[PDB]
Design a protein around this ligand. Structure first.
Ligand SMILES: CCCCCCCCCCCCCCCCCC(=O)OC[C@H](COP(=O)([O-])OCC(O)COP(=O)([O-])OC[C@@H](COC(=O)CCCCCCCCCCCCCCCCC)OC(=O)CCCCCCCCCCCCCCCCC)OC(=O)CCCCCCCCCCCCCCCCC
Ligand SMILES: CCCCCCCCCCCCCCCCCC(=O)OC[C@H](COP(=O)([O-])OCC(O)COP(=O)([O-])OC[C@@H](COC(=O)CCCCCCCCCCCCCCCCC)OC(=O)CCCCCCCCCCCCCCCCC)OC(=O)CCCCCCCCCCCCCCCCC
Ligand SMILES: CCCCCCCCCCCCCCCCCC(=O)OC[C@H](COP(=O)(O)OCCN)OC(=O)CCCCCCCCCCCCCCCCC
Ligand SMILES: CCCCCCCCCCCCCCCCCC(=O)OC[C@H](COP(=O)(O)OCCN)OC(=O)CCCCCCCCCCCCCCCCC
Ligand SMILES: CCCCCCCCCCCCCCCCCC(=O)OC[C@H](COP(=O)(O)OCCN)OC(=O)CCCCCCCCCCCCCCCCC
Ligand SMILES: CCCCCCCCCCCCCCCCCC(=O)OC[C@H](COP(=O)(O)OCCN)OC(=O)CCCCCCCCCCCCCCCCC
Ligand SMILES: CCCCCCCCCCCCCCCCCC(=O)OC[C@H](COP(=O)(O)OCCN)OC(=O)CCCCCCCCCCCCCCCCC
Ligand SMILES: CCCCCCCCCCCCCCCCCC(=O)OC[C@H](COP(=O)(O)OCCN)OC(=O)CCCCCCCCCCCCCCCCC
Ligand SMILES: CCCCCCCCCCCC(=O)OC[C@H](COP(=O)(O)OCC[N+](C)(C)C)OC(=O)CCCCCCCCCCC
Ligand SMILES: CCCCCCCCCCCCO[C@H]1O[C@H](CO)[C@@H](O[C@H]2O[C@@H](CO)[C@H](O)[C@H](O)[C@@H]2O)[C@H](O)[C@H]1O
Ligand code: SF4
Ligand code: SF4
Ligand code: SF4
Lengths: 123, 61, 388, 128, 61, 140, 341, 191
């Protein structure tokens, strides 16, 4: 047969939020445990705490979702990304898409009010 | 024979040997039937595609 | 516990004829798990086709399996003709058949003599590529391109044959058999070839079906299936050819199948050069095909139709079709959906290499790495079709 | 100073000629990724060795005794006339005793590589 | 109609060779074995004869 | 020496590799001009980008390029590698290896014929034949 | 010692330029076998291709990767080349015309060939890569496994001549070349020669490794030139071993009649013509054997490691352990044990 | 004659579909010594060596390219060109059918009313780095204005040289008109 890869998970849509809760917490645990591997494999120029901060940020992004099926899809895609990161399939270029903050400051004029954006034609 | 081979050399449109060298080639060949696949220059792709006479009489079928 | 070691066979390396990332896991010499990573030649063909007329979309198929161009455009033309409900003329059918078998000769000359090169035989490659050049000249004389002809279109053929092409094709056919024979003298009865090919890559008939394999991969396991005999499309019902089928499902049987297919393609080319009919090479309905130029420049209806076919395109009836051909790689198919418009709603290409490279994991388990090279070579994997 | 001695010293203390020519003539301005090693590829701090089959090391371990056998035959071929018909029998007994071990090696199949993922050969039987 | 089309001849073409043409060649293998055995036997006759002469020359020396 | 030993790296990605191989075939013999295609970039001097460059493949291309010892040149073979080509408006294709690597000679075609790639090789030969190595030092 | 330096320089020049043109010979012969031609453009008729390759390589960077070792990577080519070239010291181009006229010449050859395995061993250690360290192992296994067959054929030949002087081994073949009584050993020695040189059909780890990121010789610059010289010198030296063991070395027809016709007393023209004839014979034999190497590269596919080790240890060594018994028995049956010299 | 349950006359196996049986070492029409000679003396391998050697004495296929060119046809699709009439007037009339049929969107056109009242282009650009060299533009043109020459020898050092404009294309036509006339005189009846 065609056997699965190292850290594969069969797609199984929970019929309960309480089970998907445990699944999501396990995935969070796995990301946190694997962050040192993400720093060693990808030649990362920043902290392991920074990687865990980013993981927490991306897990907080979808914290107040309540539709169960959307949460199932998000869990499945999160596990896909975990398998893509822990198995060295991504390169540094794709891993550092999550980390635009660590790259140096993009120029001087970054508007946050109206007149700036107007003078730059972004209002 | 069968309907699909073998066929002699002189019925193959390829450039071969002549004289003592053919008498040697048919002595030193695993299969004298076999050909050296150089097309006969007088006959292959002559007249050239851009100098065919059939273009002047060609009409739409 | 048997800890496994992961080697990337190589995103860039010789054995892949194209670009492949085969992540193998080994326990010593033996492969235990494989993970072919693809998409490195995914160019979004199937979405681009949704933004193109059926004529604009046809050169997508020349560039999928780029050793067998005319067969890809043949299957797309067959699909669009089945939706359009138009009949290709007899001469166009004979041309498509003759050139489909020339294309089969080209594909097998690439495949067998690259399999040989990857296994170590360097000389058949360079012998066969001259015959490839001789046939590329016929491609260029009929279409104007050595590789991407854009010749077989929906409705038949772009241009009639130029004068003096059948004579030259016959001249090539009088000598191609000895080329095949000289390749066989090196490869067929050889000890090292048989060692590298006999009982390697074995796949059973049942598993060959379950995995979706076709062509030589299915015929080497013993199943006599060929779409040209079971569902003839262009002119294969009007020409005599035999189908090679093998036992033992190995790579040696696939090699023998491909050489028999060389010889049967030569047979078909002979019959088509002898029995080429007269008439038109495209449908005589100027609502589907361009009219001739001397009518487009003298007739008003002809010019209107030229204008519309080259700007808006021909509108295909609504519906859907899956049609397939016996491409030299296997069963190549196109699932088209028509929305009544000039552009497709959906075009999925069933590439024969996708299924075979998916079956690599089942076929190559338990083998050593030198045998994986032979398996990739007998699958005959071009990656434009795998990735599309 | 013989030509033998001259050659066998000259080859080593001159062999670095093109080495130095290449070191002085050629560019050298490395990158990180020019100091790199591959298209893709990585490995965490997992281990320093891979598991290997027994034959890989057994061929080397058995090279020693067979090489010593064939090198011990050198005294015989340089003494063959002086040991006339006695040493002949002795070296034949030597070769036979050492062929017994080679027979053992062949019959055990010690240099064969074995395959784990066997193909299944057992019938399909359905409990009715 | 059909005016200037590329069409075949009236009697078609002379048939081509598409069947296998790997002919069996060579003497039967035991002839090659006999030639090998004779070559090596004669070489042994020639070499062992030379060893004896070298032995007698050694006696002289 | 740089002309008569002209060793590109095996970077065939798509249907332009067919024309590269035909340039190694009997009719056009690349070896007659000194050309040998080398698997590893450490032994190579040229990179012929012959095929479309996907966004999943560009890091690999740049790694292969950076692994090449100086002197190094790049030929862009085919429309797909020159400016994205036929697949210019896709979501997965790079609009030219120009964006990823610097290019010395652009060979146009789809596919560019074997003769066209040989003409490009000759143009790069002319470029390196008019290249000032010691003369430029004597200027510096 | 002036003429000693002259002789050494002549020998070195001829050997190294023979290697450099064997590269071109390989390419052109393989080409014309493949219905092509090349190289023919980088000199007149292609006679400067190897020098172009050398000059290019000697101007390339000597990049050594991050997790590699400088010294080993740099000296392994050089040690391999030294060992390949010092084996030419014992090779005679005439009756005594040698740099090293050692009475232990066979053992010198057989002992300096024992050191060529260290190149393939140490190549694997020039990286922190775990799979190249296994490719190293496979290659070294092949080399040590076919060394036994070469040594066995050496000893089977020395059963006929009880000497380790290469000139004596050749001069014993004025009667018959040892390819006539031992024609199968010629095949076996050529096969083991092609396998020791790691040449196709025995090019497993080079072929293996160009696929993977590592496990082959990823050298640049001068290391690469040195490795090419080592390869194409060991080819000529193993064909030289073929020569002086089985094909008579420098011997030909007896030219006493012709020389008594042409000459009346020993002159330097006499000696020059003798030397030219003898070294002509040796060279035409070497040319044939090199052509055979190229032919075998052109014809056959490749082996795997299992098929190769099995070939060696289960097909070839049994025959030779049998021949060890049959040759002395043939000498005992006819009272033909050979004397010293 | 026959009624079938879940089957067919075509799905029934052929007459000899069951292979005979494997052959053992007995039932061998070849002695052990003969096949052992073929085994030890490498018969087929020497035959392959000889078939390779026979090619050594055959004519090489290699053509010396800068001095001898390969086969080209009137239909060949190479560098692009804008043609004129024998008047000297340019054939193109800004109908924009080549812009419309081009699968790669390589053509860019702009037009207006000329000073003499004629429909003629002010902009005609082809990005060769987009073009696929298919010939659809040469087929679409109703005036034989855009054509593809047989030229392939126009490789460049910069990509800004491959963004051909109207003046480049007209100069290319003025350069290649004779070759284009040969090709047209050979090819036009077939299209
Ligand atoms: C030192 C460097 C010097 C290099 C120059 C050598 C040139 C030379 O000696 O010319 C000899 C010259 C070579 O023949 P040729 O003039 O080049 O052939 C002209 C014909 O057109 C050839 O007619 P063909 O094209 O039909 O070739 C037939 C071929 C047929 O060859 C075969 O089929 C035999 C296959 C090889 C057999 C190998 C057995 C060993 O026979 C040969 O060419 C001769 C093979 C010997 O004459 C000899 O054959 C003498 C042989 C000694
Ligand atoms: C180098 C030149 C390359 C030539 C390439 C052509 C080739 O394939 O050679 C095969 C070629 C025979 O192939 P064929 O044309 O099919 O001949 C069929 C026989 O008539 C089939 O005749 P048969 O096998 O049934 O037996 C007839 C037998 C007469 O029968 C007996 O009386 C038994 C003899 C006991 C000894 O004739 C002989 O024994 C003649 C004396 C041969 C002894 C030397 C063998 C070496 O053999 C040759 O005559 C060329 C020289 C020997 C073989 C090639 C070079 C050595 C390997
Ligand atoms: C370089 C010279 C190349 C010589 C090429 C000729 C090789 C001879 C050959 O083709 O092998 C033939 C083989 C017999 O083959 P077979 O069919 O089984 O016998 C019946 C034939 N009437 O003959 C044999 O069985 C023994 C193989 C002979 C090896 C020749 C050694 C040189
Ligand atoms: C293993 C089985 C081996 C048994 C072989 C039995 C074969 C019997 C052959 C009989 C041939 C006898 C011919 C003969 O008389 O040879 C004499 C000759 C001596 O040379 P001569 O110059 O005359 O000096 C003699 C001084 N008294 O020369 C000789 O004395 C030597 C004759 C050698 C004959 C060849 C023997 C080897 C046969 C092949 C087997 C080995 C293959 C490996
Ligand atoms: C029979 C045989 C006869 C042989 C005859 C040979 C005759 C040779 C006569 C040579 C006289 C002229 C020499 C002029 C060569 C300079 C060529 C040149 O102009 O520049 C090209 C190359 C550039 O190197 P670079 O300065 O880094 O520029 C980078 C961008 N191109 O420039 C080079 O290639 C320079 C190569 C320098 C190699 C030294 C490498 C350093 C080794 C020592 C360590 C010092 C490292 C210091 C690096 C700077 C660190 C900040
Ligand atoms: C380094 C290890 C040294 C290895 C010794 C190699 C050797 O044993 O060579 C023997 C020696 C001379 O020995 P011999 O043949 O008897 O005298 C000939 C005079 N040219 O060879 C020599 O002539 C000199 C040995 C120098 C070492
Ligand atoms: C070397 C010594 C020669 C040995 C000869 C040999 O190999 O014997 C073969 C023989 C098998 O021969 P077989 O298959 O039975 O009949 C063929 C008749 N043409 O083998 C046997 O039948 C057994 C003979 C043992 C002695
Ligand atoms: C020009 C130069 C010409 C030579 C070029 C040769 C290039 C390299 C040849 C490669 C060897 C061929 C090979 O692939 O060998 C492996 C093969 C494995 O097959 P195997 O496992 O034994 O299965 C047996 C059931 N068929 O097993 C074999 O087939 C090995 C065949 C034996 C190898 C040749 C032995 C030569 C010595 C002949 C001894 C003759 C005396 C023995 C008795 C003879 C009786 C007839
Ligand atoms: C060397 C002297 C030099 O200075 O070189 C001078 C020339 C130039 O060399 P070339 O341009 O590469 O050859 C010209 C070939 N073509 C177009 C076919 C490039 O050498 C030679 O032709 C070869 C010198 C004789 C070879 C001796 C063996
Ligand atoms: C030793 C002298 C000092 C200077 C060093 C010279 C270095 C030059 C070494 C070249 C020796 C020949 O080595 C070279 O042979 C041929 C050349 O076509 C290459 O072969 C290449 O060409 C094609 C031929 O079209 C082959 O089919 C093969 O697939 C490969 O792509 C070999 O992969 C390489 O090994
Ligand atoms: S430029 Fe044309 S031939 Fe080359 S890869 Fe792109 S589509 Fe294929
Ligand atoms: S031939 Fe070239 S320019 Fe014309 S439509 Fe096709 S790709 Fe565009
Ligand atoms: S080139 Fe031809 S098709 Fe294009 S706009 Fe001009 S006239 Fe129309």
């Amino acid at each position: 047969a065609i056997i699965a890869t190292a850290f594969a998970e069969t797609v199984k849509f929970s019929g309960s939020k309480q089970e998907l809760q445990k699944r999501t917490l396990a995935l969070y645990r796995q990301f946190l445990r694997g962050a040192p591997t993400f720093a060693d494999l990808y030649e990362v120029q920043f902290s392991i705490p920074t990687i865990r901060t980013k993981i927490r940020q991306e897990f907080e992004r979808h914290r107040f979702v309540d539709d169960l099926s959307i949460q199932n899809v998000l869990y499945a895609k999160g596990h896909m990304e975990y398998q893509e990161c822990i198995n060295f399939w991504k390169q540094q270029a794709q891993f550092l898409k999550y980390f635009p903050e660590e790259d140096d400051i993009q120029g001087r004029h970054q508007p946050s009010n109206f007149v700036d954006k107007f003078l730059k034609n972004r209002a | 024979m069968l309907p699909g081979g073998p066929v002699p050399v002189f019925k193959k449109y390829t450039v071969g040997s002549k004289g003592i060298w053919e008498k040697l080639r048919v002595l030193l060949a695993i299969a004298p039937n076999r050909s050296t696949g150089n097309p006969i220059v007088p006959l292959y792709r002559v007249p050239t595609p851009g100098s065919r006479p059939e273009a002047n009489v060609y009409q739409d079928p | 516990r048997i800890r496994a070691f992961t080697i990337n066979f190589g995103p860039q390396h010789p054995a892949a004829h194209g670009v492949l990332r085969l992540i193998l896991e080994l326990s010593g010499e033996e492969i235990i798990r494989s993970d072919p990573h693809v998409g490195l030649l995914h160019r979004g063909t199937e979405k681009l086709i949704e933004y193109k007329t059926y004529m604009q979309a046809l050169p997508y198929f020349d560039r999928l399996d780029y050793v067998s161009m005319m067969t890809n455009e043949q299957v797309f033309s067959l699909a669009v003709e089945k939706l359009l409900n138009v009949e290709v003329p007899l001469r166009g059918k004979y041309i498509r058949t003759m050139f489909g078998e020339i294309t089969r000769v080209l594909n097998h000359l690439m495949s067998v003599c690259s399999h040989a090169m990857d296994v170590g035989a360097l000389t058949p490659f360079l012998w066969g590529f001259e015959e490839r050049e001789k046939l590329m000249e016929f491609y260029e004389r009929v279409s104007g391109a050595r590789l991407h002809a854009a010749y077989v279109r929906p409705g038949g053929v772009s241009q009639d044959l130029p004068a003096g092409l059948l004579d030259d094709i016959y001249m090539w056919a009088t000598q191609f058999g000895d080329r095949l024979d000289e390749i066989e003298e090196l490869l067929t009865d050889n000890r090292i070839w048989k060692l590298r090919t006999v009982n390697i890559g074995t796949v059973t008939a049942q598993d060959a079906l379950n995995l979706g394999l076709s062509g030589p991969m299915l015929r080497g396991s013993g199943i006599p299936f060929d779409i040209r005999k079971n569902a003839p499309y262009d002119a294969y019902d009007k020409v005599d050819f035999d189908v090679p089928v093998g036992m033992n499902g190995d790579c040696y049987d696939r090699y023998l199948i491909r050489m028999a297919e060389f010889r049967q393609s030569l047979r078909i080319i002979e019959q088509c050069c002898n029995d080429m009919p007269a008439g038109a090479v495209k449908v005589e309905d100027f609502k589907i095909n361009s009219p001739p130029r001397n009518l487009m420049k003298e007739d008003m209806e002809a010019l209107i139709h030229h204008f519309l076919l080259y700007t808006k395109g021909y509108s295909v009836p609504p519906g859907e079709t899956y049609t397939a051909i016996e491409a030299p790689k296997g069963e190549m198919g196109v699932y088209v959906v028509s929305d009544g418009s000039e552009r497709p709603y959906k075009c999925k290409i069933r590439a024969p290499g996708f299924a075979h490279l998916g079956a690599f994991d089942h076929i190559a388990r338990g083998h050593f790495l030198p045998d994986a090279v032979a398996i990739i070579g007998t699958m005959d994997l071009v990656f434009g079709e795998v990735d599309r | 100073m013989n030509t033998f001695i001259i050659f066998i010293i000259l080859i080593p203390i001159v062999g670095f000629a093109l080495l130095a020519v290449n070191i002085l003539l050629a560019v050298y301005k490395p990158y990180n990724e020019k100091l790199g090693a591959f298209e893709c590829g990585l490995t965490s701090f997992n281990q320093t060795r891979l598991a290997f089959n027994a034959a890989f090391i057994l061929v080397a371990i058995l090279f020693l005794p067979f090489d010593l056998e064939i090198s011990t035959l050198l005294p015989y071929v340089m003494s063959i006339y002086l040991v006339s018909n006695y040493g002949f029998t002795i070296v034949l007994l030597f070769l036979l005793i050492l062929i017994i071990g080679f027979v053992y090696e062949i019959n055990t199949n010690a240099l064969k590589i074995n395959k784990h993922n066997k193909p299944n050969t057992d019938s399909l039987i359905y409990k009715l | 109609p059909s005016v200037g089309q590329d069409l075949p001849p009236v009697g078609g073409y002379e048939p081509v060779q598409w069947r296998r043409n790997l002919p069996a060649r060579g003497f039967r293998p035991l002839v090659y074995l006999a030639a090998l055995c004779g070559i090596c036997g004669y070489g042994f006759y020639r070499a062992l004869g030379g060893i004896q002469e070298r032995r007698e020359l050694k006696r002289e020396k | 020496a740089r002309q008569g030993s002209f060793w590109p790296v095996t970077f065939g990605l798509a249907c332009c590799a067919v024309e590269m191989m035909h340039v190694s075939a009997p009719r056009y013999d690349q070896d007659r001009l000194g050309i040998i295609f080398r698997a590893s970039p450490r032994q190579s001097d040229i990179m012929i980008v012959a095929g479309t460059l996907t966004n999943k493949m560009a890091p690999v291309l740049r790694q292969v390029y950076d692994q090449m010892p100086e002197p190094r040149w790049v030929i862009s073979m085919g429309s797909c590698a020159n400016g994205g080509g036929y697949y210019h408006f896709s979501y997965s294709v790079v609009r030219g290896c120009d964006r990823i690597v610097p290019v010395d000679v652009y060979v146009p075609g789809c596919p560019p014929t074997s003769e066209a790639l040989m003409y490009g090789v000759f143009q790069l030969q002319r470029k390196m034949r008019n290249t000032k190595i010691t003369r430029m030092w004597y200027r510096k | 010692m002036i003429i000693n330096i002259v002789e050494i320089l002549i020998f070195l020049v001829c050997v190294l330029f023979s290697v450099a043109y064997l590269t071109v010979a390989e390419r052109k012969t393989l080409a014309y076998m493949q219905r092509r031609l090349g190289p023919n453009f980088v000199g007149y008729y292609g006679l400067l291709q190897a020098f172009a390759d050398a000059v290019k390589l000697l101007l390339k960077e000597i990049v050594l990767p991050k997790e590699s070792n400088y010294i080993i990577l740099v000296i392994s080519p050089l040690i391999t080349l030294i060992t390949a070239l010092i084996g030419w010291v014992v090779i005679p181009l005439g009756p005594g015309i040698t740099l090293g006229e050692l009475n232990l010449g066979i053992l010198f050859s057989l002992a300096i060939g024992s050191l060529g395995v260290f190149g393939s061993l140490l190549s694997g250690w020039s990286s922190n890569s775990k799979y190249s360290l296994l490719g190293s192992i496979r290659s070294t296994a092949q080399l040590i496994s076919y060394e036994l067959i070469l040594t066995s054929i050496f000893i089977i030949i020395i059963m006929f001549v009880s000497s380790l002087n290469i000139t004596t081994i050749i001069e014993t073949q004025r009667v018959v070349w040892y390819c006539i009584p031992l024609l199968p050993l010629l095949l076996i020695f050529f096969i083991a020669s092609v396998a020791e040189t790691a040449r196709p059909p025995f090019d497993l780890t080079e072929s293996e490794s160009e696929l993977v990121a590592g496990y082959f010789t990823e050298y640049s610059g001068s290391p690469f030139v040195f490795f090419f010289l080592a390869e194409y010198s060991n080819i000529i030296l193993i064909s030289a071993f073929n020569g002086y063991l089985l094909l008579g070395g420098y011997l030909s027809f007896n030219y006493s009649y012709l020389f008594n016709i042409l000459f009346n007393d020993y002159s330097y023209v006499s000696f020059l013509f003798e030397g030219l004839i003898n070294s002509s014979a040796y060279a035409i034999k070497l040319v044939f054997l090199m052509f055979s190497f190229i032919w075998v590269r052109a014809a056959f596919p490749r082996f795997t490691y299992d098929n190769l080790i099995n070939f060696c240890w289960i097909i070839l060594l049994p025959l030779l352990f049998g021949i060890f018994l049959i040759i002395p028995s043939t000498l005992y049956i006819f009272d033909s044990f050979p004397t010293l010299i | 004659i026959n009624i079938y349950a879940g089957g067919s006359a075509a799905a029934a196996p052929p007459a000899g579909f069951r292979i005979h049986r494997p052959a053992t070492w007995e039932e061998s029409e070849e002695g052990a010594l003969s096949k052992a000679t073929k085994y030890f003396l490498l018969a087929e391998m020497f035959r392959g060596l000889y078939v390779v050697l026979e090619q050594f004495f055959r004519a090489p296929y290699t053509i010396y390219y800068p001095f001898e060119k390969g086969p080209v046809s009137p239909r060949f699709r190479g560098e692009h060109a804008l043609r004129r009439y024998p008047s000297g007037e340019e054939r193109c009339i800004a109908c924009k059918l080549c812009e419309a049929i081009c699968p790669a969107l390589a053509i860019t056109i702009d037009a207006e009313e000329r000073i003499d009242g004629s429909r003629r282009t002010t902009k005609y650009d082809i990005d060769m780095t987009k073009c696929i060299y298919c010939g659809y533009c040469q087929e679409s043109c109703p005036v034989d204005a855009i054509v593809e020459t047989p030229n392939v020898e126009y490789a460049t050092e910069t990509r800004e040289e491959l963004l051909y404009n109207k003046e480049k294309l007209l100069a290319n036509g003025d350069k290649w008109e004779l070759e284009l006339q040969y090709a047209l005189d050979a090819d036009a009846p077939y299209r």
